[PDB]
Amino acid sequence: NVRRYNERLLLKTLRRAGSASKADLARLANMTGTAVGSIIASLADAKLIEFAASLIRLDPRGAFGIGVHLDRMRIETALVNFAGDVLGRRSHDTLLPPPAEVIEIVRHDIDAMQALLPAHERARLAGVGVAQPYNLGAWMRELGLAPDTFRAWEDVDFASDLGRTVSLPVFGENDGNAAAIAELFYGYGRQCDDFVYLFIGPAIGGGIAIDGDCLRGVTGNAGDIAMIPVLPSRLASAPPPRGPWDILLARASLHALVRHLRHHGETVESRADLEACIARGLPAVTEWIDDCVDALAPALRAVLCVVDAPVVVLDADTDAGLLDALTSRLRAALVATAPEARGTPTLVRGTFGADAGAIGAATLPMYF
Amino acid sequence: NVRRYNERLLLKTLRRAGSASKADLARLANMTGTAVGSIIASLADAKLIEFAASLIRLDPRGAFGIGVHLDRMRIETALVNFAGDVLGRRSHDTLLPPPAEVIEIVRHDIDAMQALLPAHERARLAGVGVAQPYNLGAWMRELGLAPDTFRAWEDVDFASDLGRTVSLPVFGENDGNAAAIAELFYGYGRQCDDFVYLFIGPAIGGGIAIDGDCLRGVTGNAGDIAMIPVLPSRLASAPPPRGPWDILLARASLHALVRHLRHHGETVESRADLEACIARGLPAVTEWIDDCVDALAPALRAVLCVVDAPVVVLDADTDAGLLDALTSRLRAALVATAPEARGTPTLVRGTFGADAGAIGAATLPMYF
């Protein structure tokens, strides 16, 4: 199985270099010219590489994956190629229905994606990845921490239930990890093997890149950014506290922003309502940003104490300026508390935005 | 280099099993009977295994390591064998002198340890490991967070300076990682590959076991338990707060306990003073325990959010009952906040106590 690893590494090195030569792929990865020649030849019979001394790059159309991303107000399905290009997408902005209905919706949308490939190319489609948030469970849902939408989804394995209605093989991943995986393979991870990935969605989520691989955990629950203890919000729109500690989810998620926007009389029912408010420069957004960062900087410091990565990547489900504003304020809060930390990382903007989880979900089938 | 890995794994599997057979070492680790036969034969020529179908165990005297553990009030040097037995130790209960004096102290003590091995066995001595706390740096020292003892040690690489006066090869490790490494190789890690390791010393420290390996980090700074943000102490003996956040170090370290004991009129100058106070059942110890746990339970929850390990190991530099008392209270605090977490780990008492860092420091030379 050591030939399987030397092929993934040669590929990973080509991603970092774009186009490299036989001799270059010896220099990097510190391999013998005889053995990368035999590895290049392995990737060539798999139609995974192509010509750019002769230089080779990955073949963008050498494999395909379909990625499904479920969330409280979004069912999304995307056809992604080997270079991470999104070649097709069906996005439903709807309150997440019961799992039975979603299987039917996703199955049809999986059919429209595979049918975007010509007959002579559908064979390169590796399968389907499903990305979805952690379920907090019944007790925390009925206490107010998670919407009633997820009630029909507790102790329901959607990826398995989907795999028994489609012939393609189905892989499941948490959506924070899936978005980190997109950044690892096609985004900042092409030049950086260690980082903390923060994603501000309806719920906040995240993932942990160590040594070029996404940390998943013993039970698939590593990187659970949403659950880190923080102090209760002091925003007027926050509910009363349930005790001395809250969780990062309550404060640094777009849902908290929507809750705060409604507190100042705004109506927010679609994502387009949310974007319109952000684009109006309302002070209520800045108040939420300050409160968000006030929770997220200490929570992130805790994470950096555990992991010791030099880079933090921040992305979000909604922009219209929101993300740059979050990045500036969070960077300022790190710089102002840097003397009290042993190291302080670089903060970079994520690459894929709302499309991250679907792209990362699509990657799973292509690399296994 | 795939034969180097298959040997470390066969060894790691023997640690877990004690004595196993050729056929057993095939069952476990899922290897071929032909290939573990060739691996057993590799360990036999290295005199690393011995007889307990014929059953084999590791050879306790097949290798040796010397481990050095530096701390603010302790210079310690131990001869450790391949099974983790401590065969010799020189422990100096003294205020940590400048690095120049310590090199001279440790060099003589390294000489007394190697001289405990008979001539025909000194060849199995792999070298020296040095374990020492993270240095907080000048700015945090002069703000009160670290004792003036460490001033002569900032930006001083002790392991390298020691290696240039001894012929043995010298490896350096942080002392929290080193103690985790002892637990990983000889303690709870013989049956458990994933865990968070907490060590209550003069300063608190720790380490992170993932997939059977100690997480070290990009810059050697992973597992920095001491730096996790916590709220300022409300103990009468704590200083005023420096801002809204403190660090776990200020509250969950034995130094905070000593500070609190002095606050109730006790004199504490040696470790024996500290143990006498704990054995008297003074309420001041229970107050500190409550405050310690009040900081450590949220900090640990944060860590578990990142790592997702099912077990937490807790050990301490001083016992006399202190450790069982800390474990009971911390376990109670986890159980009482379990409904607010997505998983809750088992809490176990560490195996090695004050001897952990030296044993883990000694392990480094034997496994490289």
Give residue for tokens 């590489």.
A49
Distance CA A303, CA B303 (A): 7
Long-range contacts for A336-339 (Cβ within 8 Å, ≥24 apart)? A337/A297, A337/A301, A337/B245, A339/B139, A339/B140
Q: Give the residue from A1, A208, A242, A305 with the most B CB atoms within 10 Å of its CB, the best one to mutate.
A: A305
- Beta-carbon neighbour count of residue B134 at 10 Å? 21
Which of 52-111 (A) contact B at CB < 8 A?
A: none
End-to-end CA separation in angstroms for chain A? 13
Q: Is B215 exposed, middle or buried (0-12, 13-18, 19+ CB in 10 A)?
A: buried
Distance CA B231, CA A290 (A): 19
Residues 6 or more apart in contact with residue B341 via CB below 8 angstroms: A227, B301, B304
Chain-centroid distance of CA A172 in Å reads: 13
Q: Give contacts of B2 with chain A, Cβ < 8 Å.
A: 2
Distance CA B83, CA B60 (A): 5
Parallel, antiparallel, or unpaired for β B74-81 and B229-230?
Answer: unpaired
Q: Is B74 exposed, middle or buried (0-12, 13-18, 19+ CB in 10 A)?
A: buried
Instruction: Determine contact: A219 vs chain B, CB below 8 A.
Output: yes
Distance CA B248, CA B209 (A): 20
Cα torsion B257, B259, B265, B266: sign: positive
φ and ψ at residue A350, rounded to 5 degrees = -60, 165
Q: How far is CA B23 from CA B4, B120, B335, in A?
A: 21, 33, 42
Q: Give the residue from A193, A211, A247, A342 with the most B CB atoms within 10 Å of its CB, the best one to mutate.
A: A342
Instruction: Determine contact: B336 vs chain A, CB below 8 A.
Output: no
| CA-wise closest residue to A286 among A325, A239, A252, A242 | A325
Q: How far is CA A323 from CA A50, A293, A319, B223, in A?
A: 37, 12, 5, 30
**Which residues share a beta bridge with B312?**
B196, B347
Radius of gyration for the alpha carbons in chain B, expressed in angstroms and rounded: 21
Alpha-carbon dihedral A15, A20, A22, A25, rounded to 10 degrees: -50
Q: How many CB pairs under 8 A join A and B?
A: 114
Contact B345, B196 (CB under 8 A): yes
Contact (CB<8Å) B227/A137: no
Our CA angle for A349, A310, B179, nearest 5°, is 145
In the numeric block, which tokens belong to residue B357? 């860092």
In the chain, the amino acid numbered B118 is P
The greatest distance separating any two alpha carbons of chain A, rounded to the nearest whole angstrom, comes to 69
Distance CA B272, CA B266 (A): 13
Contact (CB<8Å) B307/A306: yes
DSSP state of B227: G
Give residue for tokens 């507790």.
A154
Distance CA B286, CA B292 (A): 10
Q: Is B51 exposed, middle or buried (0-12, 13-18, 19+ CB in 10 A)?
A: exposed
Residues B10-38: b if buried by 16+ CB within 10 A, e if exposed: bbbbbbbbeebbeebbbebbebeeeebee
Helix, strand, or coil here: A67?
strand
In the chain, the amino acid numbered B61 is R
Q: Give contacts of A250 with chain B, Cβ < 8 Å.
A: none
Distance CA A241, CA B196 (A): 29
Distance CA A360, CA A69 (A): 9
Type and span of the H or E element at A11: helix A2-17
Instruction: Determine contact: B339 vs chain A, CB below 8 A.
Output: yes
Distance CA B210, CA B60 (A): 26
Q: Is A50 exposed, middle or buried (0-12, 13-18, 19+ CB in 10 A)?
A: middle
Give residue for tokens 């900087």.
A297
Instruction: Determine contact: B210 vs chain A, CB below 8 A.
Output: yes
Distance CA A156, CA B254 (A): 46
Helix, strand, or coil here: B310?
coil
Residues 6 or more apart in contact with residue A240 via CB below 8 angstroms: none
Q: Give the residue from A308, A311, A334, A346 with the most B CB atoms within 10 Å of its CB, the best one to mutate.
A: A308
| CA-wise closest residue to B206 among A163, A308, A313, A212 | A308
Q: Give contacts of A333 with chain B, Cβ < 8 Å.
A: none
Contact B177, B120 (CB under 8 A): no
Contact B127, B114 (CB under 8 A): no
Give residue for tokens 């794994």.
B9
DSSP-based helix, strand, coil % in chain B, nearest 5: 45, 20, 35
Question: Taking phi first (over 0 means left), then psi (-120 to 50 degrees means alpha), and beta for anything else, what does residue A168 get?
Answer: beta
Distance CA A273, CA A26 (A): 53
Type and span of the H or E element at B246: strand B246-247
Radius of gyration for the alpha carbons in chain A, expressed in angstroms and rounded: 21
Contact A298, A184 (CB under 8 A): no
Long-range contacts for B73-76 (Cβ within 8 Å, ≥24 apart)? B73/B202, B73/B271, B75/B102, B75/B105, B75/B106, B75/B109, B76/B357, B76/B358
Helices A283-307 & B283-307 angle (0-180, nearest 10): 100
Q: Give contacts of A303 with chain B, Cβ < 8 Å.
A: 302, 306
Specify the experimental method: X-ray
Contact (CB<8Å) B228/A343: no
In the chain, the amino acid numbered B43 is L
Q: Which of A298, A307, A343 sits opposite B306 (nearest CB)?
A: A307
**Which residues share a beta bridge with B170?**
B128
Q: Which of A216, A228, A340 sits opposite B305 (nearest CB)?
A: A228
Type and span of the H or E element at B128: strand B125-132
Contact (CB<8Å) B308/A222: yes
Q: How far is CA B1 from CA A2, A285, B4, B7, B48, in A?
A: 10, 55, 5, 10, 19
Alpha-carbon dihedral B54, B56, B62, B68, rounded to 10 degrees: -170
Instruction: Determine contact: B281 vs chain A, CB below 8 A.
Output: no
Distance CA B346, CA B337 (A): 14
Chain-centroid distance of CA A82 in Å reads: 17
Alpha-carbon dihedral B231, B347, B89, B162, rounded to 10 degrees: -50
- Broken C–N links (> 2.5 Å) in chain B, after residues: 52
In the numeric block, which tokens belong to residue B190? 């013989």
DSSP state of B232: P
Instruction: Determine contact: A30 vs chain B, CB below 8 A.
Output: no
- Broken C–N links (> 2.5 Å) in chain A, after residues: 52
Instruction: Determine contact: A119 vs chain B, CB below 8 A.
Output: no
Distance CA A320, CA A324 (A): 9
| CA-wise closest residue to B129 among B94, B100, B169 | B169
Nearest CA-CA distance, residue B222 and chain A, Å:
5
Q: How many residues are given for chain A? A: 368
Parallel, antiparallel, or unpaired for β A74-81 and B311-316?
Answer: unpaired
Question: Taking phi first (over 0 means left), then psi (-120 to 50 degrees means alpha), and beta for anything else, what does residue A25 get?
Answer: alpha
Q: Give the residue from B306, B308, B346 with the most A CB atoms within 10 Å of its CB, the best one to mutate.
A: B306
The greatest distance separating any two alpha carbons of chain B, rounded to the nearest whole angstrom, comes to 69
Q: Give the residue from A134, A337, A340, A344 with the most B CB atoms within 10 Å of its CB, the best one to mutate.
A: A340
Distance CA B165, CA B160 (A): 9
In the chain, the amino acid numbered A196 is V
**Which residues share a beta bridge with B49?**
B58
Q: How many residues are given for chain B? A: 368
In the numeric block, which tokens belong to residue B364? 């480094």
Distance CA B177, CA B262 (A): 30
Residues 6 or more apart in contact with residue A241 via CB below 8 angstroms: A232
Resolution to one decimal, Å:
2.3
| CA-wise closest residue to B71 among B355, B368, B362, B367 | B355
Q: Give contacts of A228 with chain B, Cβ < 8 Å.
A: 301-302, 305
Q: Give contacts of A310 with chain B, Cβ < 8 Å.
A: 218-219
Q: Which of A222, A231, A342 sits opposite B227 (nearest CB)?
A: A342
Instruction: Determine contact: B185 vs chain A, CB below 8 A.
Output: no
Contact (CB<8Å) B308/A221: yes
Contact A77, A90 (CB under 8 A): yes
Q: Give contacts of B301 with chain A, Cβ < 8 Å.
A: 227-229
Contact (CB<8Å) A217/B305: no
Helix, strand, or coil here: A215?
coil
Contact A242, B337 (CB under 8 A): no
| CA-wise closest residue to A149 among A99, A91, A206 | A99
Nearest CA-CA distance, residue B198 and chain A, Å:
12
How is domain A182-356 classified at the CATH fold level?
Nucleotidyltransferase; domain 5 (3.30.420)
DSSP string spanning A158-189? HHHHHHTT-SS-EEEEEHHHHHHHHHHHHSGG
Parallel, antiparallel, or unpaired for β A170-174 and A125-132?
Answer: parallel
Distance CA B11, CA B14 (A): 5
Cα torsion B27, B30, B33, B35: sign: negative
| CA-wise closest residue to A84 among A170, A179, A202, A151 | A179
Distance CA A113, CA B7 (A): 47
In the chain, the amino acid numbered B82 is F
In the chain, the amino acid numbered A204 is I
Residues 6 or more apart in contact with residue A83 via CB below 8 angstroms: A58, A60, A186
Helix, strand, or coil here: B39?
helix
Q: Give contacts of B216 with chain A, Cβ < 8 Å.
A: 308
Residues B98-122: b if buried by 16+ CB within 10 A, e if exposed: eeeebbebbeebbeebbeebeeeee
Parallel, antiparallel, or unpaired for β A311-316 and A246-247?
Answer: unpaired
In the chain, the amino acid numbered A260 is H
Contact (CB<8Å) B218/A340: no
φ and ψ at residue A127, rounded to 5 degrees = 145, -160
Distance CA A301, CA A305 (A): 6
In the chain, the amino acid numbered B302 is A
Contact (CB<8Å) B223/A247: no
Distance CA A14, CA B106 (A): 48
